[PDB]
Amino acid sequence: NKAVEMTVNLGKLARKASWRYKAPKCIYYLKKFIRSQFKSENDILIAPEVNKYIWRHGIKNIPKRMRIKIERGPSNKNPELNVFRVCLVNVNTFKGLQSQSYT
């Protein structure tokens, strides 16, 4: 049960999104990115602070980078099944930040 803290480029994840709907498709491409990164089919719980960060400048002007933190854990609904919780990491700059993992 690690906790991966990493920078995602929401520009690069949503290049194939429409400019008109960059924000909701960014949620789609992020959850598709988490599943390909950790090869799993557990649900991704996007924290509302993450979703508020993406829609910060409306639907077209998504921020380029975004530091997140992924917590594998059991589901509060059903503890039989694990789940991903993407939580937002507030950072002042992205220059030089390395992706890390810890428990």
Partner RNA sequence: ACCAGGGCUCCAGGGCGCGCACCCCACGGCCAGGGCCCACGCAGGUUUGGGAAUUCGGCAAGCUGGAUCCGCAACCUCGGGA
Partner RNA sequence: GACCACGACGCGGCCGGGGGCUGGUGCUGUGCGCGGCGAGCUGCGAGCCGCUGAGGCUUCCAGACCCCUGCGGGGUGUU
Q: Are 62 and 10 in contact (CB under 8 A)?
A: yes
Q: What letter represents residue 101's amino acid?
A: S
CA–CA separation, 64 vs 7, rounded Å?
A: 10
Indicate the residue among 75 and 82 with the shorter CB distance to RNA.
82
Minimum CB separation of residue 29 from RNA in Å reads 7
| Smallest distance from RNA to CB 93, Å | 7
Residues that bind RNA (CB under 7 A): 2, 4, 6-9, 11-12, 15-16, 18, 25, 28, 33, 36-40, 64-65, 94-101
State the nearest-atom distance from the C-beta of 65 to RNA, in Å.
Answer: 5
CB of 34 to RNA, least distance (A): 9
Report the SS3 class of residue 34: helix
Structure tokens at 4: 């991966």
Q: Which is nearer to RNA, 78 or 98 (CB)?
A: 98
Of the pair 15, 79, the CB lying nearest RNA is at 15
Using CA atoms, how far apart are residues 73 and 95, in angstroms rounded to an integer? 30
- In this complex, which beta carbon is closest to RNA, that of residue 40 or of residue 75? 40
**What is 47-78 written as a DSSP string?**
-HHHHHHHTTTTTT---SEEEEEEEEEE-SS-
